[PDB]
């Protein structure tokens, strides 16, 4: 029952689950009645969802993955837990290889979990093994990690993955589990179709929505004192405990370096200490400023794309975007650095049609430079498509969280006075209608 999962969880891996979803996903794999899809975040609970069932399975669990780094790092950890896990890769000595292939062909093999590349899984040099495994009914699950690699609307398309559809079909008896971290509903629809996944596909997608975060859009065209507006915003978000004075830290994002330097200074002078972060600075300078912000010598940082959340923070109570980001995902990713501690936080986008256009041009320029180097890809469509969705995020009226959830493919979220539009629908209508007056400035 549930009983089995608890014991195998503690006895081996030494744990309860990180998410009640992670639990219910794993459980549904284990019952093995249905193919299953998992789109969780970079939180490696995805791994556990297929691994734990595999050990309960009284049969062999194949596990496709696209490159070796990914495999090795996991199979090592699986070994550390005293688990009969095996890799079959083209970076393997002839003798190692032939020893495993032999293992698989045995009545009652050593191997419980086989990590294969799509290359090996395709190669005729493995097919008979495959068939004989099937024939002895010794295959208990087929797993497809980084499933997004099957979709051209994905960020990491690998033709090899396309072959996997046929494979699933061949391995009829066995359920299939697909997993990824980042899947637009287009990707997920590609997955279900490309990997010929049997209905009913059971789905375990972690929603992108987060209660404690408050999204809003402002229009730089409808603001007399921009710098002042930012001060007020930073101030309201910080100093949530006024007897202490200033509590928490926050981020300001720019496209350009001059913007960053200039904006740090303007904020600092208005009484809100901020330091700049851009690739323009020397490496030493950057690593110092990061510490200052991390130790809360400086409550605010003003940064370009080069942040990369190398070391992210719990008490980030505001992320303000001075220019629109390249993608809805890029804004979600960036803004998502806010409120990791679960305490109320503020995410603000400062939209401009002037900005929209300059970035649209820069996207077009850096796409044309790849088309002449390479050619016409369905990914070039996606680059612009990804950006159009975020222009639409700004320019349309509606729950800011539900606009996000549409793009990522989540249920309509429980906002609860959790964004500008949900809080005051009339002031948003005003601000939009206002952008039409000031359309010609």
């Amino acid at each position, epitope marked *: 029952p549930e009983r089995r999962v608890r014991s195998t969880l503690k006895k081996v891996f030494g744990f309860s689950f990180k998410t*009640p*979803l992670q639990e*219910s996903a794993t459980m549904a794999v284990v019952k093995g009645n249905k193919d299953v*899809f998992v789109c969780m975040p970079t939180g490696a609970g995805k791994s556990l969802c297929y691994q734990l069932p595999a050990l309960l399975a009284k049969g062999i669990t194949i596990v496709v993955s696209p490159l070796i780094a990914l495999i090795q790092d996991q199979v090592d950890h699986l070994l550390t837990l005293k688990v009969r896990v095996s890799s079959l890769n083209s970076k393997l000595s002839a003798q190692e290889r032939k020893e495993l292939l032999a293992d698989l062909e045995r009545e009652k093999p050593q191997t419980k979990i086989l990590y294969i590349t799509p290359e090996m899984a395709a190669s005729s040099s493995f097919q008979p093994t495959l068939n004989s495994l099937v024939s002895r009914h010794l295959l208990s699950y087929l797993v497809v990690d980084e499933a997004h690699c099957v979709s051209q609307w994905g960020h990491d398309f690998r033709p090899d993955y396309l072959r996997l559809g046929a494979l699933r079909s061949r391995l009829g008896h066995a359920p299939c589990v697909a997993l990824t971290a980042t899947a637009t*509903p287009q990707v*997920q*629809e590609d997955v*279900f179709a490309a990997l010929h996944l049997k*209905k*009913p*596909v*059971a*789905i*375990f*997608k*972690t*929603p992108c*929505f987060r209660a404690n975060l408050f999204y809003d859009v402002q229009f730089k065209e409808l603001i007399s004192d921009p710098y002042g507006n930012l001060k007020d915003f930073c101030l309201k978000a910080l100093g949530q405990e006024a007897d202490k004075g200033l509590s928490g830290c926050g981020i300001v994002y720019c496209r350009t370096r001059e913007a960053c330097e200039q904006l740090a200074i303007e904020l600092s002078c208005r009484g809100v200490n901020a330091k700049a972060y851009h690739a323009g600075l020397k490496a030493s300078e950057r690593t110092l400023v990061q510490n200052d912000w991390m130790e809360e010598k400086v409550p605010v940082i003003v940064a370009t794309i080069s942040f990369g959340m190398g070391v992210d923070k719990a008490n980030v109570r505001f992320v303000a975007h001075w220019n629109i980001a390249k993608s809805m995902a890029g804004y979600y990713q960036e803004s998502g650095r806010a409120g990791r501690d679960g305490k109320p936080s503020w995410c603000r986008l400062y939209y401009s049609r002037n900005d929209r256009d300059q970035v649209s041009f820069l996207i077009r320029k850096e796409v044309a430079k790849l088309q002449e180097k390479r050619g016409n890809k369905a990914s070039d469509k996606a680059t612009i498509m990804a950006f159009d969705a975020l222009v639409t995020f700004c320019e349309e009226l509606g729950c800011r969280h539900a606009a996000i959830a549409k793009y990522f*493919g*989540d*249920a*309509l*979220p*429980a906002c609860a006075k959790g964004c500008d539009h949900c809080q005051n629908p009339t002031a948003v209508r005003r601000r939009l209608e206002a952008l039409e007056r000031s359309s010609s400035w």
Partner: nanobody
Amino acid sequence: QVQLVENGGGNVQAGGSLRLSCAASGSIFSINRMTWYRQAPGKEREWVAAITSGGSTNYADSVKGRFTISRDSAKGTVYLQMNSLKPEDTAVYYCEAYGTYTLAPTGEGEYDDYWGQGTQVTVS
């Protein structure tokens, strides 16, 4: 689970009209293809008309321009307007919810095809 239920069926005279709706219960996010099928007793199921996610509509050549299907996106309900009926059109009418992506905010959801109960429709 998911429920697909039809209504709007009944008895009419030749050259009459009816409007049919199949109501989709459950945490629906999308339905790849909602399809209208009719079952004359003692004969083969007939494909009638169908609407894709994003409102693209196609109809059988036997019911072209007489029948017309629509989605009240807000309602989450699809309608088959049947005007200029004939005794041929006398059948049971039901829907196929092909590629029915359901999902709650817990992350827990499914993807399956559902078939409706179906409403009796007689044309004198």
